[PDB]
Amino acid sequence: VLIYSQMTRMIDLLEEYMVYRKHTYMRLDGSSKISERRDMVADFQNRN
DNA sequence: TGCCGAGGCCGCTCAATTGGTCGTAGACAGCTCTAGCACCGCTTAAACGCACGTACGCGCTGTCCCCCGCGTTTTAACCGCCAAGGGGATTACTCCCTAGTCTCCAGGCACGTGTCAGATATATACATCCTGTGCATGTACTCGGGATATTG
């Protein structure tokens, strides 16, 4: 699944939820560095 | 009326500081020096400090007597300002030259000792130079009257 959301304040609340119910997750706000986006996309492909 | 135009609030992205973590390299703290030569302790015969009326030198004191201070205000331009213009101090880039590193390499000389002399100190006798004192004039001063210079 992809979850899209429209407030950085909310993506923080979603991250607190993803940590509590132990789903595994990965986030890419506009505040992420350009180099992080590369690794993070390449890890969402290539893995179960 | 209309339209809209102009209008006012909120997530990306980048760019210094800020504080954090990594690992590694001499340089700091410390040991044992060890070694030795200064500090000390112990005498001595030594100099020089110091607690202490009195002659008296001058620091301080009670007076009167006047300029420079003290007070006013006009004015006078001094000094401040602002705003504009020109450039020259500044910024950011690219090419370039050497500052700096290391390394090798020598001998110059600053370092060190090895001996012992011409040096200068110290005493006694001493004569002399120099100080403190006393003592005339000669000028550098303060004043008055007139000439030259300069401000308004």
Query: CA–CA distance from A48 to each of A9, A18, A19, A25, A44 (Å)?
Result: 28, 17, 18, 12, 8
Specify the nucleotide whose C1' lies closest to residue A29 (CA): B12
Distance CA A28, CA A14 (A): 13
For this experimental structure, what is the resolution in angstroms? 3.4
E strands in chain A: none
- Given a contact cutoff of 8 angstroms between Cβ atoms, the answer to whether A44 and A27 are in contact is no
CB distance A19 to A7 below 8 Å? no
CA pseudo-torsion sign A18, A3, A14, A36: positive
CA distance A48 to A36: 20
CA of A42 to C1' of B31 (A): 60
**How far apart (Å, rounded) are the C-alpha atoms in residues A12 and A7?**
9
Closest nucleotide to A7, Cα to C1': B11
Structure tokens that stand for A33 in this block? 């560095």
A8 CB inside 7 Å of strand B = yes
Output the furthest CA–CA distance in chain A (Å, rounded).
30
